[PDB]
Amino acid sequence: LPVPGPAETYPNSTKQYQPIIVEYAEKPDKAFIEAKTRILPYLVGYEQQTKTQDEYLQSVNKYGSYAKGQKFKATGRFRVEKNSNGRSWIVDPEGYPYYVRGIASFRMDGNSSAFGKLYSSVDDWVAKSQKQFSEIGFHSVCAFGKEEGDKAVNDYNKSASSPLTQAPSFSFLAEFKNSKGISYPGQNVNLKIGLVFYDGWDEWCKEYLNSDAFGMFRNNPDVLGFFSDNEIDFSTWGNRLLDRFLKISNKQDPAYIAAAKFMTDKDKSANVSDVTDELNNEFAGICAEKYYSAIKNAVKASKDPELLYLGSRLHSLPKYNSYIIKAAGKYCDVISINYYSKWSPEKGYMDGWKNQAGGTPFMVTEFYTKGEDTKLDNSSGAGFVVRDQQNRGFAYQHFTLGLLEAKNCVGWVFFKYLDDEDCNKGMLDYNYKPYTSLTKYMSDINWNVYNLIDYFDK
Residue 239 belongs to what H/E stretch? Predict the structure, then answer.
């Protein structure tokens, strides 16, 4: 480990740490900067409690929930709770607190020759992976499995005694568009959220929840919950949502109609000149309200009202819009947030999320860094570049410690299972080989989340 500097108070915390420096670049061809970083060995007043894989596995149940402390009422299904000190938890079917530690994109999308040498079947792949992941303190796979990955895990969990819990991702807005035989508003996919104003949105959601798309997931205790979309544009850099809706050419478009109505309702002119960031943000919130409420109401009306709705994986500017967070807190069981472009979780914003959402928790559905040591292209994706796998480990510790302090965060998902052929996004390389330097540092956090929480909350 690098030698650290003098103890100092971590920003927005009561706890001290001895900082190290980790270099990072925003893209592989850019200059690296030096970032003060908090790692687990250098937390003042904490010493790593769970030190081996066996110690860890003896402390948790088959879901990865802490088995030796507090538990809550069991309902036979994953659900959301809050403890007396204002911390939210996902609770497992037996009532035990499950701190979410997931892996995204669990699918067989590496080198096929490597796959064949390492795994003898799809079942073997799931089984070996469930064990591999549990040893590192990951227990769930979340999003982007596609049909084959989702079915593989679903089939495995039906017969296995030790599940790999799953959280499938869907594309509700696209599916609605396809069901109705229409185009995106303004012929622009980036305006797809405007589909919530089209005739039949609420009803279509009800039907979709009751359809075969949910057949393997409904009433299935090994399903953590579902995501309805990913990174919906609710305003982007350089383009506000409300401005773009008002500029839709076809003024018969329900999205235009709704935007113009909103303006008129606020005693304003239905023109781009009257639009402010506040108005834009509020309008985006109305869109979010119509989106999330339709989906939550669809779950409640469905054949499985106990399936958790984990949101739409907010990102970019939308995750900072208090109006969208307010909407998501009213309807989502857990608000999902993809968390990019920051070295440190922003505790002021996370505290804002707590208030805005009415106490409904959030989860981080994607975060990572890439290692320059791989020598891969490394240009695709928003994760920062660090020098090597050890520093990916340090970045994982820094980011996750930041999240552990947020009492409204119920956990996270590392993006992702495998590298791309040309980018170090994975916990495993493209030949299905774990980056052991990374997984060591991941394990040290993941095994200790419950006692770290105790340390932060005491």
Answer: none
